[PDB]
């Protein structure tokens, strides 16, 4: 599932995709869809998340993985790359601009996708962040790094 | 005459619905054609 | 157990067989029996499946295996060959004509036969499908890929 950007007046506001059907439609900020051809359809909302539900087409079958919540501190890739921290969010360093970076998923090294960003950049030299993922029971964990930098 | 007629027709209608329902109740166990483990019902294959 | 075809006006409508007695008599579509000699007998029905019960002869002893429901995503062979997917049905690719292909069993590589097709060809490039098999409790799992291509 390609990181279809959301062209917010020429931006890439959400470089979103569909992890097996349900698309990472972020009602978070904005953006003219990249796959507007595919994205000609409408979507749900997400109050707890400012997002939307894709439920991609049958033609759009075989979209992306939806790795489970099983995760230690491990380097899950992103546009900024990978980072490995679990208790605190992934051990990225301070120096990546989360604003705009919203839409980066947890590209765990096992081909695993289990999470995607929500904000909360950094105070120390490291950068743990806010995310959205599956919870301990696999619930739709909406991770909120306290004092979150927008996106 | 009218009452015996109507009571007989009511009873026979009940009878056919009985048979219908009974064969419908038969229909489940057609899983067992797999020839596998038993599920302790009225009919028998010990 | 040979895949005895069902000659639907010269077709092979069901290339059926008997997995240890009970024959894969598909009341699904049609077909003049291949082993009509053997198939001179009559059969049961299957409302939930459009099939029929063989219960093959004592002379017809030693027919075929009836492998249990224990199955990961594994390449079970067919007329079209083998395919390996479990959550979604076996990972065949889109490009096989399920219509007419009804009668292909789950020829798992361990000499295991536990399932047979029911329909539901493909939307994505892969082809998971509808089947008939043993369930989690081993029940007669009649697998129905939602939106099933006939056979």
Chains B and A touch (3+ CB pairs under 8 A): no
Alpha-carbon distance C34 to A108, whole Å? 53
Subunit contact A58:C124, Cβ cutoff 8 A = yes
Å between C139 CA and nearest CA of chain B = 7
**C104 close contact with B: CB closer than 8 A:** no
- CB contacts, 8 Å: C126 with chain A: 61-62
- CB contacts, 8 Å: C113 with chain B: none
Q: Give Cα A24 distance to the centre of its chain.
A: 7
8 Å CB contact between C12 and C4? no
Q: Which helix (H) or strand (E) holds C106?
A: strand C105-108
Subunit contact C140:B33, Cβ cutoff 8 A = yes
Cross-sheet strand order for the sheet of C140-142: C105-108, C112-119, C130-134, C140-142
Nearest to C31 by CA among C61, C46, C57, C51: C51
8 Å CB contact between A91 and A14? no
In degrees rounded to 5, what are phi and psi of residue A95?
Answer: 135, 10
Q: Give Cα B28 distance to the centre of its chain.
A: 12
Alpha-carbon distance A31 to A44, whole Å? 16
To what resolution in angstroms was this structure determined? 8.5
Tokens of A113: 């996708």
A27 burial level (CB within 10 Å; 0-12, 13-18, 19+): middle
- CB contacts, 8 Å: C140 with chain B: 30-31, 33-34
Tokens of A55: 């439920």
What is the sign, positive or negative, of the torsion defined by CA atoms of B13, B15, B16, B21?
positive
8 Å CB contact between C46 and C27? yes
C87 burial level (CB within 10 Å; 0-12, 13-18, 19+): exposed
Quote the radius of gyration of chain B (alpha carbons, Å).
18
Breaks (C-N over 2.5 A) in chain C follow: none
Alpha-carbon distance C138 to C127, whole Å? 24
Nearest to C27 by CA among C53, C5, C1: C53
- CB contacts, 8 Å: A38 with chain C: none
At residue A107, the 3 state secondary structure works out as strand
Subunit contact A59:C126, Cβ cutoff 8 A = no
Tokens of A9: 């007046």
Chain B interface disruption, residue of C23, C48, C68, most B CBs within 10 A: C48
Subunit contact B33:C53, Cβ cutoff 8 A = yes
> Which ranges in C10-97 belong to alpha helices (H)?
none
Nearest to C23 by CA among C42, C10, C47: C42
Alpha-carbon distance A43 to A50, whole Å? 12
Catalytic residue IDs of C: 28, 50, 102
Taking phi first (over 0 means left), then psi (-120 to 50 degrees means alpha), and beta for anything else, what does residue A98 get?
A: alpha
Tokens of A133: 């993922």
What residues pair up with A112 in beta bridges, in sequence order? Answer: A108
Nearest to C138 by CA among A111, B34, A39, A94: B34
Method: cryo-EM
Chain B interface disruption, residue of C21, C50, C140, C142, most B CBs within 10 A: C140
A120 burial level (CB within 10 Å; 0-12, 13-18, 19+): buried
C3 burial level (CB within 10 Å; 0-12, 13-18, 19+): middle
């Amino acid at each position: 599932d390609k990181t279809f950007p959301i062209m917010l007046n020429g931006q890439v506001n959400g470089y979103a995709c569909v992890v097996g059907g349900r698309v990472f439609k972020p009602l978070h900020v904005e953006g003219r869809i990249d796959n507007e051809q595919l994205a000609a359809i409408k979507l749900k909302k997400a109050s707890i998340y400012d997002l939307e539900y894709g439920d991609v087409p049958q033609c759009m079958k075989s979209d992306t993985l939806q790795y489970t919540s099983d995760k230690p501190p491990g380097f899950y890739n992103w546009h900024h790359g990978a980072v490995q921290y679990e208790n605190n969010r992934f051990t990225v360093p301070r120096g990546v601009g989360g604003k705009g970076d919203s839409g980066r998923p947890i590209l765990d090294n096992k081909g695993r996708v289990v999470a995607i960003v929500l904000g909360g950049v950094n105070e120390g030299s490291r950068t743990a962040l806010s995310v959205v993922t599956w919870n301990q029971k696999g619930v739709t964990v909406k991770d909120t790094p306290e004092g979150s930098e927008p996106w | 005459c009218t009452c015996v007629a109507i009571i007989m027709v009511s009873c026979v209608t009940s009878v056919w619905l009985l048979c219908r329902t009974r064969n419908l109740c038969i229909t489940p166990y057609k899983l067992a054609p797999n020839a596998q483990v038993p599920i302790l019902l009225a009919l028998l294959c010990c």
